[PDB]
Every structure is written in structure tokens, then in C-alpha cells.
Design a protein around this ligand. Sequence first.
Ligand SMILES: [Mg+2]
Ligand SMILES: [Mg+2]
Ligand SMILES: [Mg+2]
Ligand SMILES: [Mg+2]
Ligand SMILES: [Mg+2]
Ligand SMILES: [Mg+2]
Ligand SMILES: [Mg+2]
Ligand SMILES: [Mg+2]
Ligand SMILES: [Mg+2]
Ligand SMILES: [Mg+2]
Ligand SMILES: [Mg+2]
Ligand SMILES: [Mg+2]
Ligand SMILES: [Mg+2]
Ligand SMILES: [Mg+2]
Ligand SMILES: [Mg+2]
Ligand SMILES: [Mg+2]
Ligand SMILES: [Mg+2]
Ligand SMILES: [Mg+2]
Ligand SMILES: [Mg+2]
Ligand SMILES: [Mg+2]
Ligand SMILES: [Mg+2]
Ligand SMILES: [Mg+2]
Ligand SMILES: [Mg+2]
Ligand SMILES: [Mg+2]
Ligand SMILES: [Mg+2]
Ligand SMILES: [Mg+2]
Ligand SMILES: [Mg+2]
Ligand SMILES: [Mg+2]
Ligand SMILES: [Mg+2]
Ligand SMILES: [Mg+2]
Ligand SMILES: [Mg+2]
Ligand SMILES: [Mg+2]
Lengths: 94, 58, 116, 136, 81
Amino acid sequence: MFTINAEVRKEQGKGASRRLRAANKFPAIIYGGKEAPLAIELDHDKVMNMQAKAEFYSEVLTIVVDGKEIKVKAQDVQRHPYKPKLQHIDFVRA
Amino acid sequence: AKTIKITQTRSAIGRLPKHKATLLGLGLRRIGHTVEREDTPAIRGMINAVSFMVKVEE
Amino acid sequence: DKKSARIRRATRARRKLQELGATRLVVHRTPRHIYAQVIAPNGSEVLVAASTVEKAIAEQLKYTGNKDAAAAVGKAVAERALEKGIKDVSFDRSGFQYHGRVQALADAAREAGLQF
Amino acid sequence: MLQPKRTKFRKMHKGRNRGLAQGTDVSFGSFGLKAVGRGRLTARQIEAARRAMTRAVKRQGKIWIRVFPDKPITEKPLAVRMGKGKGNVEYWVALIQPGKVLYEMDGVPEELAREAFKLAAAKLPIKTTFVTKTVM
Amino acid sequence: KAGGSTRNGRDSEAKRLGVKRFGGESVLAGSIIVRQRGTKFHAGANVGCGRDHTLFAKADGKVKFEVKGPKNRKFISIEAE
RNA sequence: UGCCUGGCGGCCGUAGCGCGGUGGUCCCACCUGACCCCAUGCCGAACUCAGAAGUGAAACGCCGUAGCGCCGAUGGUAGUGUGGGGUCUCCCCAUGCGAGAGUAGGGAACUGCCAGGCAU
RNA sequence: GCUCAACGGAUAAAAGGUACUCCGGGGAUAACAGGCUGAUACCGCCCAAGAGUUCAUAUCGACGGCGGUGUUUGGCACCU
RNA sequence: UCCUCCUAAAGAGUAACGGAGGAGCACGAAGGUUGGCUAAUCCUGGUCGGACAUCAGGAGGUUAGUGCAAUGGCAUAAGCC
RNA sequence: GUGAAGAGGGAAACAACCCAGACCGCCAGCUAAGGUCCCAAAGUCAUGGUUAAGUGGGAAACGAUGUGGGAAGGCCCAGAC
Ligand SMILES: [Mg+2]
Ligand SMILES: [Mg+2]
Ligand SMILES: [Mg+2]
Ligand SMILES: [Mg+2]
Ligand SMILES: [Mg+2]
Ligand SMILES: [Mg+2]
Ligand SMILES: [Mg+2]
Ligand SMILES: [Mg+2]
Ligand SMILES: [Mg+2]
Ligand SMILES: [Mg+2]
Ligand SMILES: [Mg+2]
Ligand SMILES: [Mg+2]
Ligand SMILES: [Mg+2]
Ligand SMILES: [Mg+2]
Ligand SMILES: [Mg+2]
Ligand SMILES: [Mg+2]
Ligand SMILES: [Mg+2]
Ligand SMILES: [Mg+2]
Ligand SMILES: [Mg+2]
Ligand SMILES: [Mg+2]
Ligand SMILES: [Mg+2]
Ligand SMILES: [Mg+2]
Ligand SMILES: [Mg+2]
Ligand SMILES: [Mg+2]
Ligand SMILES: [Mg+2]
Ligand SMILES: [Mg+2]
Ligand SMILES: [Mg+2]
Ligand SMILES: [Mg+2]
Ligand SMILES: [Mg+2]
Ligand SMILES: [Mg+2]
Ligand SMILES: [Mg+2]
Ligand SMILES: [Mg+2]
């Protein structure tokens, strides 16, 4: 089991996403199902440690936003082109 | 009626011809020139285009 | 195959009348029946129509797919067109040869009063 | 030395080498040598780093080469003035963006792949790094 | 060390093709809309095709670009005005 | 008004392929025959004519089916207009625009006019 | 009726030499030298396959890579 | 001198002793019109007959063709009788 | 875009760079870039860090227990190094 803490993005786009990756975070999105897609932001060192396991990309993960658990799976991840960092992760509601 | 103050704060010497025409459309002539214009989207678009060298007072 | 080659054979003069804005008489020919309809220059609605599938025409005939039926059809569609005030059309062979039943239809419509 | 057999055209513009790369993930093998810098790799530099890792593995494992030199490079001869046509094709390069995986390798241990790719990166002008096969 | 040449010195004159009147642009009858080699565009309503596939207006009005047909070809028509 | 079919369009693949099934009162198709109208650089194959014994085998139409084709977000990324900056072959910041590919997902078209048949 | 093709066509009709030379001008343009640059050159360095009885690094150092100098051959034509 | 593409920076245009190719004609039908038709290649079978003539079927669907260079077009064919 | 055909202030000096467009006069004020220890006008200003190289105040591959910060790990008072 992996429990990840997230926050809803107050603003989107290129300048915000660059500025989060400056401030040691990275955006992601939860989508799928009938609910609208949710634009979250994660801590980078936590999720970068959590993703080193294949359990991360196999099991069902719990994302806590506003104390509201969402069981998801890691659908796709955008990585930094030459640094061991994460740009963006897609989470599909399982 | 919904009028704002626009003040040219930088020079227009090396600037683009389109920006010089935008400052002419606002009626700014020299630096520190405070002008009084209505608040339309067309005015806001010229202020957006030359926001680096004007100062809108509203 | 035969249907498609007939459509390819018809779709040049159909597009030409489409840009001419021509009110057009459309013939359709089967071994048993023969069809006619007058189409507005938009190509989306009809004005008059006649066939050998109609009872009022077929009951006066021996066989529905001979030249005498085709002339009776071109006469009926011309008399309906002149009833509705349509006089000048352009004949669409619909990929058939202007020959036989098609020619006897158009000659009947010319003789009854349409002008093409 | 890698070289195209046929070309549609004999010469090519100098171009630029801006942008990020595409061959980012370790596709085929288990370990990879990823480019961090920017530049062009000749066919000699590619074949020398291939020799250094083939010898470092004693032909153990399988080595992929992800890049291929397809850009012709012209030079004018010495004591030739700047006019009178484009220079003669001298050698072939591959344009390298940051993130391009240059080589891949499997069938060997990780430490052996580290020392092989280090012996290869000592033959390359650009700065490289070591990568592994990531799940997703 | 003198020498060389260049078998590749030639080029032809620019034929000034393109679209002369764009969409929503009122034209007179006979006004050239597009000069082009092939039928990159096609002639629609009130638009003639020239000898060199030049699209000219047969009437007066506004130019209308539109995509029709099963092949998604680009047609030029003159709206009334 | 319902069903089915034929003709002419609109639209141009969410509309196309494939696979399975299904249709013959009418219509359509194949069909029968051809001395004639007409036809084959030979051939009634096609074109055409005179027809209606047979069959829905094929074709066509309809239904179903996600193996494809196709469509396709959200977010992010690339790029870039202006202004500014750096370590200036290349990048960054503010701001504005914002892809492509891919993912979730959608999806086995919709609709108009006329005519005919069977029911109502 | 012109390969007036030097193709907006100087005439219907035209090749060369000058170290025996001359005039007007140009650093708008070359040779010398300077300048910029540093391909080349030279001098270093990095990796280390190997040679060195064994032993990569006593001495060498393949395949390739990074610099420095302004020093050769050159490039440009900024001064004269 | 003329044509075509790139350079040419998504209107036009745009230079270099820049990168690549052609023209200095042909046709009294290879033009006009009406009518009709639809390729390349490959597979199988088949007398001489063979990798490859002609013939029949099938896949394919313009990968062909365009009097000639390239580009843009072309099925309503601008292609072929 | 500037110079050419444009002065002034700054970049030590420095046509083309940065700020900015000189009608004239004044022993008046505010500012731009750039600056505030002295040459030489203005902070030896304030708060919190980093550097010990005169780095600043010239340069690469590569090399190194220089030093500051961060996240994680594996041995360990059953006794680690
Ligand atoms: Mg930006
Ligand atoms: Mg069915
Ligand atoms: Mg028959
Ligand atoms: Mg059937
Ligand atoms: Mg988007
Ligand atoms: Mg998209
Ligand atoms: Mg479909
Ligand atoms: Mg279907
Ligand atoms: Mg001449
Ligand atoms: Mg001339
Ligand atoms: Mg003299
Ligand atoms: Mg000079
Ligand atoms: Mg000299
Ligand atoms: Mg050097
Ligand atoms: Mg050298
Ligand atoms: Mg030894
Ligand atoms: Mg040595
Ligand atoms: Mg070396
Ligand atoms: Mg010059
Ligand atoms: Mg001098
Ligand atoms: Mg252009
Ligand atoms: Mg442009
Ligand atoms: Mg011809
Ligand atoms: Mg025809
Ligand atoms: Mg054979
Ligand atoms: Mg000045
Ligand atoms: Mg000064
Ligand atoms: Mg100055
Ligand atoms: Mg200075
Ligand atoms: Mg002051
Ligand atoms: Mg200041
Ligand atoms: Mg002082």
C-alpha cells in the first residue's frame, strides 16, 4: 500500500508547472470514471522514492486530497529527459 | 465614466514601430506624460501591448 | 459493380447540371419498370414523379418494362409537369444510354410538351 | 564505421541542434548510456565506444546502438578560398540532444555495465550518464 | 591553390501564385481569386476555372472558402452581395 | 402512423472494412430468350431489346458483433509573440497563445424529399 | 528574314603583346608587414587496448576525446 | 536567357562562384466533342514459352499513367479506346 | 534597432552596446541605466546565509575525504566502524 498526499492546483499551465517543479513538487492528474478530472500536485522526493518499486506501478494507490482518499493506479508518468525526476503522472481511478 | 490614467514611464526610442503606433493611439507623447482614457477592451489591449513602458493608474 | 459504373457514368452530367442550376428530369431504368422524377435545382426535393409501379399507369399496360410503358411514363410525367407549370427541364439519363426505353420516354416528354 | 549505403542527396545544410531528444527510455536492453549534453557524435566516436564496451564485456551480453550517423559534414580543403561551391563530404555525424539514449546493454551485471559504459564515455565528447530499464 | 566551380547556379523566376482575395472579401465579376498550378482548390458556385487552373469570379460578391465532397476537397464559391 | 424497398440529395469515415446471421407479396438483383432497335477491334460478357419459368447462391439491403479503421478529451510537454536575463553554437524568467503524439473514453452513423408495397 | 545564346540585343562588319611604356584614380582591390580568427601547425592533457619475460601507467601508448599558444601553412580583406 | 524544387523564416517576394535537375521542342492528332473504359505489381493454373510475351482467375487499389525535367494536380478522371 | 545623418549619462578609455532623442538660459528639483571605502557624486545601510579561493578579478575534458544545504538508505548498546 502506498498513501500519497496531494493538493488541488489553484492555477494551471506552463508557468505554474515550471514553478512547482522549481519548488520541489510536480503536477499530476486523476481521471477516469464518470467524475471530472482532478488536477493535483505531489511532493517530488516522496513520489520519486515511492515509484522505484514495481509495486508502485502494479498495486492500487491511495491519494489523499482534502482528507478524501481516492484509490487509483499509475497509468502513465512523464519523466525528466535526463535527470532522475518526474514531470507529471496520470492516475486512473481504479 | 470609467476612465483611467495612463502614464508613459519609459522611452520609445528603440521600440518597435507597432509599439510606437500604440503609444500614438493612446496619445502618449513624452515620459511622465499622464493621459486620461476611457476603459474599453481596445484600450486595455494597447495597455497590454505596451505594459512594459506604461503605468496604468486605476 | 454495374450499379457503381452506372453512377460513375452519370455523375459528370449530374454535377454539370448541379452547377447549371437546371431543373432536371431523372430517368431510372430497370428490366421490369421505368421511373421518372423532376428534381429541383437543389437536388434535395422533387416536384413530380411517374413510374410503371403506379397502378394508374401499370393497369393500362401489357408489360411494365417495354418502350410503350416508357412512353406512357414520359407522357404522364410531362402532363403532371405542365399541370404544375414546369416546362423547361434537362434530361438526366442516369448513366444509361440514350436509346430504347430511355429515348422513347424522352421523345414522349418532348411530344407532350417538355422542352429539352 | 557507420555510414548510410544510399542517400537521397549527397550534401545537407548545417542546420541547428536545438530541442530535446526522443530516444529517452531504455527500450530494448536493461542498461543504457544516456546523453546529457548536446552535440554531434561521429562514426569513429561511436565505433570506438562500441569497441571499448565489447572488449569490456568479452562479447558477453548484447549491445544495442540507438543512434546512427546520417548527417554528412563537408569541409573545404586547406588553402582554398571561401567561394567556388560547397566543400567536399568528409565524415558523418549524428546530432545528439539531451536525453538521447546512445547505447543499450543486457546479459551482463550492473557493475560490469557501469565500467563498460564508463570506458565508452571516456571516448565521447559529450557528457553521459547511466540509466536502467524503468517500469513504465 | 585555385580551382572549382558550381554546376548548380540556376533557378527560375517566382510566379507570384497564391490567393489574391481571401474570405469575406468582396470582389467584382472576373476578379482573380487564386492562381495555382493544379486544382489545389476547386471551382464552386459562380466561380470559373481558367486554362491554367486559375479561379476567377463569374459574378459579384463575397468569397466563400468551404470543404465539401467525400474527398474533403476545398471549394471556392462566390456568395451574393 | 409503423415496417420494408427504390430513386434523388445533405454530410464525408463516430458514416469505412471485417465476422456471423437474415431477406423475396411488392421492389431489386440474378435470370429466360434474342429473327428484330442496338452491340462485340471475337463473343447478347458488356450495351440493348422482348420478357417473367426459377432463385435469393452471389450482389444488394437489414440486424448483430469492438479484430481493426476512425473520432477523441483533461492535464502536462514541445514550440512561440512581446518584454527582460544568463554560464549566450544554447537556455531561463514574467506574460499571452498553445500543439503533435499518446491516455481515459467514444464509436457498428444521422437526416431530408418523392413514390410503391404490406400492415394499420 | 538574326545560337543579335554576352539571350533589354553598343556596329552590317574586329584578335593579341608591352619588362620600352604612359595618364587619371583606388588601400572601394592584390603582393610585404600589421589586425581578427585559429582550420592547419606546434605544445600539453584525458581514457587505457596493448608492447614492456610477469606487470596498462620505468619508458612507450592504438581507437577516440578535451584544451592552450599565436609559431607554420592558410582564411578574411579592417589600416597603409 | 527560360522552367522546377530547396534555401525562403506557414500571404507575395527575397541573395551567394549556395544544394539538385531540365528547356531552345513535339503533335493535322498527341487538338475539339460524344459515348464508353480504369491501372502498377504479385499469386495460381496453363502448348511451344523461357525471370519476363499471350490467356483465365485472385489479391491489391493508382504504389500506375501524364510526349519530355521537377513540383502541384488528376476517378466527374486532366489517364485509356 | 542604432550609427550613418544623433549630442548627453554609463560600460576605464570604446561609431554600431545599455539608458535616453540637445530651441536657448538658470550657482533650482525629481529620476533612467549604472552605481554609493578613497581616486570620484552617493549606504563602510539593515537583516539572514555562502566563500578563504584575492574566487570575485580569464578558460575545457577530467580529477579530488574542500565546504554548506536537502531527501533517502544499511550496520549499530544482542555492541557497529
Ligand atoms: Mg514562458
Ligand atoms: Mg441481415
Ligand atoms: Mg442478361
Ligand atoms: Mg444471400
Ligand atoms: Mg492540452
Ligand atoms: Mg491532441
Ligand atoms: Mg465503422
Ligand atoms: Mg457493418
Ligand atoms: Mg551584350
Ligand atoms: Mg543582358
Ligand atoms: Mg600613375
Ligand atoms: Mg580595405
Ligand atoms: Mg597580409
Ligand atoms: Mg585552438
Ligand atoms: Mg587541430
Ligand atoms: Mg608492471
Ligand atoms: Mg604514454
Ligand atoms: Mg586523448
Ligand atoms: Mg566586406
Ligand atoms: Mg598597418
Ligand atoms: Mg512564401
Ligand atoms: Mg513569411
Ligand atoms: Mg493530350
Ligand atoms: Mg464522359
Ligand atoms: Mg508463365
Ligand atoms: Mg551617442
Ligand atoms: Mg565616459
Ligand atoms: Mg554613449
Ligand atoms: Mg569599456
Ligand atoms: Mg534624488
Ligand atoms: Mg537603480
Ligand atoms: Mg564620496
